Design a protein around this ligand. Structure first.
Ligand SMILES: CN(C(=O)NCc1cccc(F)c1Cl)[C@H](COC(=O)Nc1cc2ccccc2cn1)C[C@@H](O)CO
Ligand SMILES: Nc1ncnc2c1ncn2[C@@H]1O[C@H](COP(=O)(O)OP(=O)(O)O)[C@@H](O)[C@H]1O
Ligand SMILES: [Mg+2]
Length: 707
């Protein structure tokens, strides 16, 4: 008489019913005999043992959070990370290597229907691929989840799968495609508390095909590079990989050429050398040079890149003091400035004059004011950030030029999306507002997609669709952020506070409270703080330095020197309105791309916060299924007809417990079923007859596996 009950340890737990009393129930925990008294409302029905480790949970005959968790947990400990759940897929990071990604296995999935194999990322990629050919439509695979859940690893498996089955030992273009992420990760990833290879940018990879299905080219867009990581890092964390690769792996020749000087010598490396376990930075340096070489980067190109990486570190070694009894910046030591100008190809005394005494065009004459130590420090830091962002964008453009070399744009594409999930931190700033905004758009596309798929299924069968679009809940919160006028949203207000002469951050928070103080998803929280109610939680924002972040100011004098650098590469980097405005445009264009594809969702789940293999943290998993919408899904299909079965199938399964309903001889499938149902005296509120299937409530079909 086993049942599921809430457990503070395990999330849910097996228990046997021992006593009832109206709405009360007394139960016996199956693990330790302990007695527990609950409301009948807290009890969840258990599925029969024939569904153990079921590969598609839509097949479950009792849809509830407890039964879902159990199935995911059971498969996981048998080393089975992939599970289907009706209209989307779920993946629990194993935190160890599995024998499931070989060349053999790739060939086994070629051509297969999702349900003819065990669930795998390969099968999502293959089915998306066949649909591209068969329907002449563009496809997308979206990989989502917390830091460390496994989005980047699954993205890379879809690339390596496609480069194998849609090739035209690989061939030049596919060899280069498989090198793109190794290059981008060296420059865009960093060791973080949650992930030793954290993506500090979002990316969307477009792969282009023929009418025939042959890979013809590819293109990559990146989003939200964490520029500021180049300047300072939190406890236990590293900057981008490339800085440790170069310092640890440079030849003696290179060490000299690029004025390199070791781990403890760089203000921009906050924690000096910190190791990544099971990787050595010198070996990694070698993999990264090899990848750039396969990509077609000339030796001089590779060296110019590394010269820039080095100069970013040098900028950080400049020190400004003040003149006696003033605030005016002075540069008593000259050495850092000399080394960096050497690497940047400009003139150290013009560079100095630019930082300390900028000429400012101001109409009625040219003001040449001296800068405070605070001002010169900010300028140098803005410059190192801008310098590195430009370097990443340059590497991205040249990766793209090597990958779109054939000038053929193909017939179709398959896009792969790899962007950070919704996460709440101790501090939530402008960059988190943008990430959390992006996930409002993405989660809405998900609710909407499920909505359209359901509505079409109901339409083709008769029955009876009375829900409004599932994605509409997210609209008020989206509108609070992105609305131009009427009431202007957070972004628009920011953009306006920026053209205000004597505005502060807190000035902005106050105008916000004024115009959105009573918006449904707003809440006043400290004087730069405010809250927004997102799909997955209340988030506290701190608006400190947002005015500056929206504007992203640089010293235009030194910027001008670098535009005329005597080094051709640095010159190219510097070959040339708000940060909020620009990002909104980037996100508008991405959503437009996605809405015009057939999307496949891959929900990545992190098992624990300790990077451990074979340990599942129940409440951590449940919280993640909540952010995803997986639990809204269970609730919504609970209020519907979760079990749906074709006539022919209903016949040859329950003719056992209903043999005498159907007379001997041929009969139409709907006819036979109607008889089987009348022969069941089933309450007409618990089923619906469709064109090809019967639609059952939960868990009407469970009731029949016995009685
Ligand atoms: C019945 N169903 C299942 O797949 N049920 C298992 C299941 C559902 C949800 C979370 C889960 F974990 C699991 Cl095991 C298929 C279609 O039902 C949906 O999937 N809508 C849906 C709506 C949502 C609305 C908002 C947010 C998320 C949503 C997710 N999803 C259709 C099947 O008959 C065919 O395979
Ligand atoms: N399918 C997998 N097989 C083996 N290891 C994995 C798998 N998925 C994730 N990992 C491990 O977890 C780490 C973090 O995964 P990653 O995909 O980088 O996270 P994110 O979702 O933040 O991109 C990886 O470095 C890898 O060690
Ligand atoms: Mg990643």
């Amino acid at each position: 008489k086993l049942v599921w009950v809430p457990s503070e340890k395990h999330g849910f737990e097996a228990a046997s019913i021992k006593e009832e009393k109206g709405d009360e129930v007394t139960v016996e925990l199956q693990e330790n005999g302990k007695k527990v008294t609950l409301s009948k409302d807290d009890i969840q029905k258990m599925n029969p043992p024939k569904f153990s480790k079921v590969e598609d949970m839509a097949e479950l005959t009792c849809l509830n959070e407890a039964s879902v968790l159990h199935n995911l947990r059971e498969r996981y400990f048998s080393g089975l990370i992939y599970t289907y759940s009706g209209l989307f897929c779920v993946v629990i990071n194993p935190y160890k290597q599995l024998p499931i990604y070989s060349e053999k296995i790739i060939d086994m999935y070629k051509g297969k229907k999702r349900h003819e194999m065990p669930p795998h990322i390969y099968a999502i990629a293959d089915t998306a691929y066949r649909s591209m050919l068969q329907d002449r439509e563009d496809q997308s695979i979206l990989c989502t989840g917390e830091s460390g859940a496994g989005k980047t690893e699954n993205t890379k498996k879809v690339i390596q799968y496609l480069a194998v089955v849609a090739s035209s030992p690989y061939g030049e273009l596919e060899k280069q495609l498989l090198q793109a992420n190794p290059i981008l990760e060296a420059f865009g990833n960093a060791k973080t508390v949650k992930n030793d290879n954290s993506s500090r940018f979002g990316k969307f990879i477009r792969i282009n095909f023929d009418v025939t299905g042959y890979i013809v080219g590819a293109n990559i867009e990146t989003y939200l590079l964490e520029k500021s990581r180049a300047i300072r890092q939190a406890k236990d964390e590293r900057t981008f990989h490339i800085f440790y690769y170069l310092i640890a792996g440079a030849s003696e020749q290179m060490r000299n050429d690029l004025l390199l000087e070791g781990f403890n010598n760089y203000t921009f490396l906050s924690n000096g050398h910190v190791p990544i376990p099971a990787q050595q930075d010198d070996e990694m340096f070698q993999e990264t040079l090899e990848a750039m070489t396969i990509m077609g980067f000339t030796e001089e190109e590779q060296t110019s890149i590394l010269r820039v990486v080095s100069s970013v570190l040098q900028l950080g070694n400049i020190v400004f003091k003040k003149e006696r009894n003033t605030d005016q910046a002075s540069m008593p030591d000259n050495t850092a400035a000399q080394k960096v100008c050497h690497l940047m190809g400009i003139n150290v005394t013009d560079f100095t004059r630019s930082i300390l005494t900028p000429r400012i065009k101001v109409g009625a004459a040219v003001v040449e004011k001296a800068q405070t130590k605070e001002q010169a420090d900010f300028a140098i830091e803005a410059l190192a950030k801008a310098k590195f962002e430009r370097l990443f964008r340059w590497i991205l453009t040249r990766v793209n030029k090597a990958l779109d070399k054939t000038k053929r744009q193909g017939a179709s594409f398959l896009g792969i999306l790899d962007i950070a999930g919704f996460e709440i931190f101790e501090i939530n700033s402008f960059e988190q507002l943008c990430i959390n905004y992006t996930n409002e758009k993405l989660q809405q596309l998900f609710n909407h997609t499920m909505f359209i798929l359901e509505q079409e299924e109901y339409q083709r069968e008769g029955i009876e669709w009375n829900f409004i679009d599932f994605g509409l809940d997210l609209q008020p919160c989206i509108e609070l952020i992105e609305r131009p006028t009427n009431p202007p949203g957070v972004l628009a207000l920011l953009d306006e506070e920026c053209w205000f002469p004597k505005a502060t951050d807190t000035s902005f928070v106050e105008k916000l409270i004024q115009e959105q103080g009573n918006h449904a998803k707003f809440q006043k929280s400290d004087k730069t703080e405010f809250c927004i109610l997102h799909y997955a939680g209340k988030v506290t924002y701190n608006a400190s330095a947002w005015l500056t972040k929206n504007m992203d100011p640089l010293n235009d004098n030194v910027t001008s020197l670098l535009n005329q650098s005597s080094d051709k590469f640095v010159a190219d980097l510097w070959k040339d309105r708000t940060v909020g405005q620009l990002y909104k445009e980037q996100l508008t264009k991405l959503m437009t791309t996605l809405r015009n594809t057939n999307p496949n969702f891959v929900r990545c789940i992190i098992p624990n916060h300790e990077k451990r293999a074979g340990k599942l943290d129940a409440h951590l998993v449940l919280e993640q299924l909540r952010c995803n919408g997986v639990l809204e899904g269970i609730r919504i299909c609970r209020q519907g007809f979760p079990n749906r079965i074709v006539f022919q199938e209903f016949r040859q399964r329950y003719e056992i417990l209903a043999a005498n309903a159907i007379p001997k001889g041929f009969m139409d499938g709907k006819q036979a079923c109607i008889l089987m149902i009348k022969a069941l005296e089933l309450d007409p509120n618990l089923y619906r007859i469709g064109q090809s299937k019967i639609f059952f409530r939960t868990g009407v079909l469970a009731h029949l596996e016995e009685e």
